[PDB]
């Protein structure tokens with residue numbers, strides 16, 4: 165599943181690099197990514213589709229570190245971006261703009277212009293007012309903007325019953341070209357919505373509105389010669405006759421989640437009448453998923469100890485009730501022990517802040533037995549370098 | 557203008573021209589000059605609330621230690637330092653902010669359950685007022701660092717309040733098993749340990765007596781027991797000079813809460829304990845608004861897609877800078893992030909047109925302090941108004957700086 169495994173010496177390694185070595189060299193907390201894990205997951209997705217025309221558009225928001233993006237860009241990956249910042253990251257990482265699709269409900273005129281100038285693949289439009297703005301901007305630039313409409317399955321996009329009308333509007337707007345349909349179908353409803361979607365592509369085709377690609381979003385869906393999920397399998401089988409509809413997938417978490425761990429150190433162990441607490445050095449500003457959402461992430465020792473385990477809540481170092489990484493974890497701990505939080509490669513560093521004026525941590529990439537720093541730990545004083553006191 | 561408008565909470569109010577003003581500066585002008593989204597703070601609002609709190613205790617020896625984490629902008633901190641405020645910090649970064657803002661380190665208390673040796677060393681070097689120690693292992697670490705520097709660390713122990721288990725079993729169980737502090741029954745023992753260590757110097761007790769939702773009677777008995785402990789420790793040679801009661805014991809708008817008054821009635825007999833309060837939201841919350849622009853009005857349910865996202869404000873009344881005449885419609889205000897949790901308000905009645913500017917009230921605390929770059933979005937500008945003057949207190953981040961510390965794979 166991934167390359168974070170214990171080796172013969174009894175400790176946890178990332179590929180061929182001991183995690184403890186990285187903690188020593190770069191300090192804690194620390195995000196560590198595995199190049200091989202990212203590549204193995206991307207290829208599983210890329211190859212599961214078969215010869216069917218497709219494009220994997222990695223969801224940049226999941227993990228947008230330049231090293232991570234560069235890894236995927238070298239494989240020829242596409243990218244799904246939600247801002248001009250993400251588009252600039254893709255370009256800095258060597259990504260191909262012709263393989264970029266731009267999503268998001270609040271795209272600005274400035275963002276649309278930069279994307280049009282870079283000639284991205286498609287704008288995934290979520291509303292009629294957005295469609296109007298993209299038409300205005302493309303006209304001002306004297307170009308034609310490639311679009312897809314985000315549609316919602318019949319049960320945040322446009323409803324199925326207004327889809328035809330909004331597509332006809334896009335078709336009548338002078339500065340837009342209709343290219344795709346975006347439907348985040350990711351089991352009975354999935355299939356039912358897929359048919360209604362294909363029927364819509366056909367009816368539009370009769371009207372001279374030609375959809376060339378279908379974007380099915382993320383939340384899929386590789387079964388491991390890796391095969392697609394029953395969901396994807398159900399779709400591919402219905403697309404033999406329906407061609408040459410290029411299929412676009414937007415995996416994020418599926419590629420990046422298990423490719424990263426957060427290494428943290430146990431500062432203090434505290435005991436109450438019925439509970440035990442391990443105070444760790446990673447806080448809500450470093451990894452917010454458990455606090456914000458109700459995410460359960462496996463927490464394991466870099467060097468497991470023998471003996472009777474005690475049940476601990478793992479809590480951060482500041483002063484918040486939601487400052488914790490895990491609850492009710494049976495572990496054998498001593499102060500100073502290092503832990504790894506699995507599944508921290510997605511929605512980990514991307515959501516990190518400077519809350520409590522804490523510098524963001526370093527991000528490191530392993531590649532066999534080599535280690536590359538891909539994001540330096542922030543220098544403390546840089547946190548307020550843009551600020552000013554009152555002159556009074 | 558004798559009829560200059562105000563409200564009980566802040567200086568963000570409408571005037572003769574039909575628009576929302578921040579003190580004597582139109583919010584619309586600031587949005588025009590600095591862009592949106594924008595955090596706008598009111599100097600007079602911060603001062604009003606800090607003074608209301610400072611005056612509530614009257615003549616009794618005290619220190620207000622503002623909770624820096626609520627809003628640690630240098631301009632905000634400087635406003636308070638100018639009034640002689642103290643500060644409660646939870647990291648070395650917050651300590652450095654206070655120093656850069658002109659604050660007095662001898663009025664700084666350092667809280668937090670996971671202070672590092674490095675943080676303790678710097679805090680000791682700057683001679684802060686006191687370390688609010690949350691566990692025995694932390695007490696040992698501070699003794700170690702103080703021992704290495706050959707100095708005496710000033711300490712206060714965070715002691716859970718002595719709730720009576722017979723009358724408040726659930727609260728008692730909750731307190732005793734929480735991650736914060738040391739249980740009341742262990743207080744004397746851990747104080748004796750601190751007393752035995754020559755590189756520690758016992759100065760206080762940190763007991764957040766009003767933080768448990770409790771009636772006046774139980775609060776008072778619990779307070780009496782805390783005071784009796786202080787006395788028993790004193791007779792035993794361990795001299796506590798200050799009591800830090802934490803946050804929440806606010807003011808009723810301008811006299812103190814009945815809780816605050818009961819406490820004061822007991823402290824005023826001896827008057828040998830300096831009282832420390834740690835307000836944060838109570839000082840900063842209403843001193844700020846987040847100004848945001850409506851991008852699109854999407855109708856299905858109605859959605860006003862605004863330019864402020866979860867990365868800007870993750871936590872509130874939402875009002876127009878320039879109210880329109882018409883029949884208000886109901887909207888959910890949602891940001892641009894591709895997340896279901898990316899919203900600022902649900903079901904709000906407003907008369908809107910695309911491009912309109914809105915102000916999100918009560919955004920001065922836990923607003924910018926929690927802002928991130930999620931979706932590679934630069935953090936916004938922070939401006940402070942002072943009468944008719946405008947001060948830029950945090951520049952908007954330049955987009956390319958977001959990945960300046962990063963690198964690609966070797967070639």
Ligand SMILES: [Cl-]
Nearest residue numbers: 434691692693
């Ligand atoms: Cl303890």
